[PDB]
């Protein structure tokens, strides 16, 4: 009955963002310059995450050291060594006293910041995934939802250490996830050129968006909470609407041949920042399908991208052991 | 400016940076090798003759070789985590020709990868006693082949089949090192040591403004 689904999708025949938002003011050339360069790591940066306080910033690299920055003063608050050197996800709890990590070890280690003894220790480990961890995000102080490369995601419980709910309906390997602003839903983009919206409470998929033609690498909720953007290996991003259940925009260029590595949204949802495998970043307009800036400060690659919670800054990692804060 | 809390935070940051600088020497002085192969290939017994990680050193240089097998048989994505390995120890079972075709194909795919194009691959034709027993007791180009007895021609046929991809598509930034191993060969550690020595020598030639 896929033909019926495609006919229902095509029932909205007047689906052209280039016409509805044609007569709008363009954002213009966004010239963002590097403010800080956190050059403390040793090797390729794979993941990073901001805290709710909007100052502290956790990051992980290839050398197996999970470090915590202070972008205001460029000071390393903590530096947590890791058992496994291949970690590709990072997390920072909203309470700010927990940091998670994971990777090829198929374990979501959680490190207790600000303990009574003033040290960083592994508070809990979650070893229920049969594939490499791709993205872990802290739902709250007690729950964390993780997606691995074994086609399934899972919602965890810190007190018991076991999955409360699992999400097994997918194809390929899940590459990244992103929570809703209400923290009641989340989405997961995988290598099957498809992204699915999940419900945390029920543990059942609600919608599936098959618009891309290659492995989706990064996915991030819209600030409004009713959309998201998917960056894939086809060197082209897209924006999906949960209500419309259809791709809205297609941020593609003829000169772009390198796939997407990271995708993040600005505070207002007007500026879509996309990390690229083409040695730099790109700063895409959300609803104009045109570029607005290039963050070419990095000299190896771009592997992670994060926008500060109140929108005051962005942070882009690289395959060189640098971390550049832009503004 | 410089308060009591700010001075303590700066001192903590300097201590962290000193620890990072201390660990940088350890990280740079250890060579990380990725072990790759098939199920029939005896890559496990190559490690046993010295994710599952092993640690060994030859001339006080510490090598750390990794045999990851807990993944879901799809390596498009997690193979990028080994982009900075000094070498790949791709192991071939040369005594199974039907599997040798797939070994040839995935060696070609590894060689022509975008991220592994700068990583040299150490080639181990693991099963050679079995190959000698089989030949002594598929590919139409074997009849029209000349040695660069029969078991030597077969060994070098497989070696040249791998070197055809290792040469016709190589960009000059990485090389393939073919070696002939066995089940009881104990020189694999030193072979990997010397191959890594030459790999680092080539990067040093490139980075020392000599080439």
């Amino acid at each position, epitope marked *: 009955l*896929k033909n019926q689904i*495609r006919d229902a999708r095509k029932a909205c025949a007047d689906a052209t963002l280039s016409q509805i938002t044609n007569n709008i003011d363009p954002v213009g050339r966004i010239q963002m310059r590097t403010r800080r360069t956190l050059r403390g790591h040793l090797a390729k940066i794979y993941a990073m995450h901001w805290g709710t306080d909007s100052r502290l910033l956790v990051s992980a690299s290839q050398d197996g050291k999970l470090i915590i920055w202070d972008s205001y003063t460029t000071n390393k608050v903590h530096a947590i060594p890791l058992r496994s050197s291949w970690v590709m996800t990072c997390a920072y709890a909203p309470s700010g006293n927990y940091v998670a990590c994971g990777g090829l070890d198929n374990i979501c280690s959680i490190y207790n910041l600000k303990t009574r003894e003033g040290n960083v220790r592994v508070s809990r480990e979650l070893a229920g995934h049969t594939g490499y961890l791709s993205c872990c995000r802290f739902l709250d102080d007690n729950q964390i939802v993780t997606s691995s490369g074994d086609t399934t995601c899972a919602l965890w419980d810190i007190e018991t250490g076991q999955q409360t709910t699992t999400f097994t309906g997918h*194809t*390929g390997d899940v590459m990244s996830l992103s929570l809703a602003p209400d923290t009641r839903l989340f989405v997961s983009g995988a*290598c*099957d*050129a*498809s992204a699915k919206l999940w419900d945390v409470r029920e543990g059942m998929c609600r919608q599936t968006f*098959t*618009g891309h*033609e*290659s*492995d989706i690498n990064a996915i991030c909720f819209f600030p409004n909470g009713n959309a998201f953007a998917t960056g894939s*290996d*086809d*060197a082209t991003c897209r924006l999906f609407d949960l209500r419309a259940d259809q791709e809205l925009m297609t941020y593609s260029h003829d000169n772009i*041949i390198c*796939g997407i590595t990271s995708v993040s949204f600005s505070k207002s949802g007007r500026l879509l920042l996309a990390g690229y495998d083409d040695f730099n970043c790109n700063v895409w307009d959300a609803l104009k399908a045109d570029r607005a800036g290039v963050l070419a400060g990095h000299d190896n690659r771009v592997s992670c991208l994060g926008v500060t919670d109140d929108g005051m800054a962005v942070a882009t990692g690289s395959w060189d052991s640098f971390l550049k804060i832009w503004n | 400016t410089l308060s009591a809390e700010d001075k303590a935070a700066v001192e903590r940051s300097k201590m962290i940076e000193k620890q990072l600088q201390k660990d940088k020497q350890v990280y740079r002085a250890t060579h990380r090798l990725l072990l790759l192969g098939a199920d029939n290939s005896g890559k496990s017994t190559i490690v046993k003759q010295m994710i599952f990680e092993t640690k060994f050193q030859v001339d006080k240089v510490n090598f750390h070789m990794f045999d990851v097998g807990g993944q879901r*048989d*799809e*390596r*498009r994505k997690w*193979i990028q985590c080994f982009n900075d390995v000094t070498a790949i120890i791709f192991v071939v079972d040369s005594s199974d020709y039907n599997r040798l*075709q*797939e070994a040839l*194909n*995935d060696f070609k*795919s*590894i060689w*022509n*990868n*975008r991220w592994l194009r700068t990583i040299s691959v150490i080639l181990f034709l693991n099963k050679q006693d079995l190959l000698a027993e089989k030949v002594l007791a*598929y*590919f*139409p*180009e074997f009849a029209r082949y000349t040695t660069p007895p029969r078991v030597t021609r077969a060994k070098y046929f497989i070696r040249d089949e791998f070197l055809r991809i290792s040469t016709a598509s190589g960009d000059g930034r990485h090389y393939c090192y073919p070696h002939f191993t066995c089940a009881v060969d104990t020189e694999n550690a030193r072979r990997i040591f010397n191959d890594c020595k030459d790999i680092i020598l080539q990067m040093n030639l490139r980075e020392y403004n000599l080439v």
Partner: nanobody
Amino acid sequence: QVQLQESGGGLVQPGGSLRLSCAASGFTFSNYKMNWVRQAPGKGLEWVSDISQSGASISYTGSVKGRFTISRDNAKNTLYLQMNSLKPEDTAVYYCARCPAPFTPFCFDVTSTTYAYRGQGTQVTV
């Protein structure tokens, strides 16, 4: 939505000939290189042939070269396999496959047990 569908099989004489055609939709044909996947009974997913972009590089298998012809049509958005000589040991299912990387000759995962861009092939019986 990447979809692939094959046709033209299930009737072969020993030493006979037919032609395999896989249709493609939902993705650009020219930017990707497409392989061939053979699944014999009691056997894993094998490999047959290759074509690169606009037919720049062509590769076969030792048991395939000399009797199989690989053809592709970017304008028609379909990939062809011409079968000239036959033996009764190639009775299998031909999965018309590709690799996710565009503008890159890196078909790393094509013969995997599960694969998103590998359509359901057609049975071939000699």
